[PDB]
DNA sequence: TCCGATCGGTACCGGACATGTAAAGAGCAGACCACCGACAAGT
């Protein structure tokens, strides 16, 4: 619906702030809880 | 801004050096230029030093 | 690594955007790390190999379609089951319906998912089509996927 | 940037028939509303935190908080 | 054709002045200097 496409332009935002742009790089990625950290 | 732009740049040698990922090596980099930039021109992009 | 001079990048006009014919806001994105830039594309070995290259995508949305199918099927033996242990004990029409209208949901999730998976495979196959020098691929995951 | 004031309304908690029987002795009132080509109250609070600040994802709560966060806390 | 952003500029002589925080600690090693023992050859 409109949300997804709220989020896509907000991901393809400039962004000009480099701060901002490293913690939207950052966020990208998901975590590890218990074991996955150990596969690794 | 000499001291900025030194510590960077050998920062981003280490960096280089470790291997580490796209993502830390891009974040030096961008760093990087805007430290060059700031020596050459203050305020011309972004927010003054 | 190499860092653009700022006075023949931010002035008015650029003339590094005048040299190169991009806009400021595309050199701004391109050398402050925030959209990647196709340098150079070999057009005799796309062009050479472009019915292979459009065959194996052919292939794969046919593979993607089967498992869609294949998700369908799935979800029609479940109802046929439900329906099947409706018959088996009673029960009242209301909790009938509400089970059909999560199926019904729940195949027009999986519906538009396909439609979704087969509009990107449609839109990364034009974006290599028209793949040309000095174009900015401002998705991530479009360029790491190309 | 300017943003039509019937959409700050609207993400206040108010719906179309407040705004009509609170602003209906005015026509520029009816001019905005009329031509803001958004409805609903989702809508207009994701446009806000939108406009308000760009990149961020929006979701239900966080751009109320921020509001709250900005004018009545 | 219209208009939201961005950059350029805005008198002179005299004078005046100087930063305000720290989440630590330990183990091991390297370089340099003030105090020293021997031992044979030149003085």
Same mark, same amino acid.
Request: glycine fraction near 4%; hydrophobic fraction near 40%.
């Given at each position: 619906?409109?949300?997804?496409?709220?989020?896509?332009?907000?991901?393809?935002?400039?962004?000009?702030?480099?701060?901002?742009?490293?913690?939207?790089?950052?966020?990208?990625?998901?975590?590890?809880?218990?074991?996955?950290?150990?596969?690794? | 801004?000499?001291?900025?732009?030194?510590?960077?740049?050998?920062?981003?040698?280490?960096?280089?050096?470790?291997?580490?990922?796209?993502?830390?090596?891009?974040?030096?980099?961008?760093?990087?230029?805007?430290?060059?930039?700031?020596?050459?021109?203050?305020?011309?992009?972004?927010?003054?030093? | !690594?190499?860092?653009?001079?700022?006075?023949?990048?931010?002035?008015?006009?650029?003339?590094?955007?005048?040299?190169?014919?991009?806009?400021?806001?595309?050199?701004?994105?391109?050398?402050?790390?925030?959209?990647?830039?196709?340098?150079?594309?070999?057009?005799?070995?796309?062009?050479?190999?472009?019915?292979?290259?459009?065959?194996?995508?052919?292939?794969?949305?046919?593979?993607?379609?089967?498992?869609?199918?294949?998700?369908?099927?799935?979800?029609?033996?479940?109802?046929?089951?439900?329906?099947?242990?409706?018959? !088996?004990?009673?029960?009242?029409?209301?909790?009938?319906?509400?089970?059909?209208?999560?199926?019904?949901?729940?195949?027009?999730?999986?519906?538009?998912?396909?439609?979704?998976?087969?509009?990107?495979?449609?839109?990364?196959?034009?974006?290599?089509?028209?793949? !040309?020098?000095?174009?900015?691929?401002?998705?991530?995951?479009?360029?790491?996927?190309? | 940037?300017?943003?039509?004031?019937?959409?700050?309304?609207?993400?206040?908690?108010?719906?179309?028939?407040?705004?009509?029987?609170?602003?209906?002795?005015?026509?520029?009132?009816?001019?905005?509303?009329?031509?803001?080509?958004?409805?609903?109250?989702?809508?207009?609070?994701?446009?806000?935190?939108?406009?308000?600040?760009?990149?961020?994802?929006?979701?239900?709560?966080?751009?109320?908080?921020?509001?709250?966060?900005?004018?009545?806390?």
């Amino acid at each position: 619906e409109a949300l997804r496409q709220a989020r896509k332009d907000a991901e393809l935002t400039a962004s000009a702030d480099s701060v901002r742009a490293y913690l939207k790089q950052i966020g990208k990625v998901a975590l590890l809880n218990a074991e996955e950290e150990v596969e690794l | 801004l000499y001291r900025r732009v030194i510590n960077r740049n050998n920062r981003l040698k280490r960096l280089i050096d470790l291997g580490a990922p796209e993502i830390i090596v891009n974040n030096e980099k961008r760093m990087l230029q805007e430290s060059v930039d700031a020596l050459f021109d203050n305020g011309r992009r972004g927010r003054p030093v | !690594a190499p860092v653009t001079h700022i006075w023949y990048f931010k002035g008015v006009p650029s003339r590094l955007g005048y040299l190169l014919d991009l806009a400021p806001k595309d050199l701004e994105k391109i050398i402050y790390f925030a959209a990647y830039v196709i340098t150079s594309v070999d057009d005799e070995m796309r062009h050479n190999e472009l019915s292979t290259l459009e065959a194996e995508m052919a292939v794969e949305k046919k593979a993607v379609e089967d498992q869609r199918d294949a998700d369908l099927e799935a979800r029609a033996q479940k109802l046929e089951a439900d329906l099947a242990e409706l018959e !088996a004990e009673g029960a009242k029409s209301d909790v009938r319906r509400k089970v059909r209208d999560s199926g019904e949901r729940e195949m027009r999730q999986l519906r538009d998912r396909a439609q979704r998976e087969l509009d990107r495979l449609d839109e990364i196959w034009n974006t290599f089509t028209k793949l !040309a020098p000095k174009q900015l691929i401002v998705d991530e995951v479009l360029y790491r996927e190309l | 940037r300017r943003q039509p004031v019937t959409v700050l309304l609207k993400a206040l908690g108010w719906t179309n028939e407040q705004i009509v029987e609170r602003f209906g002795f005015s026509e520029i009132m009816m001019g905005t509303l009329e031509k803001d080509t958004t409805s609903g109250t989702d809508e207009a609070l994701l446009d806000i935190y939108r406009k308000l600040r760009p990149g961020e994802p929006p979701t239900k709560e966080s751009a109320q908080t921020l509001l709250e966060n900005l004018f009545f806390k």
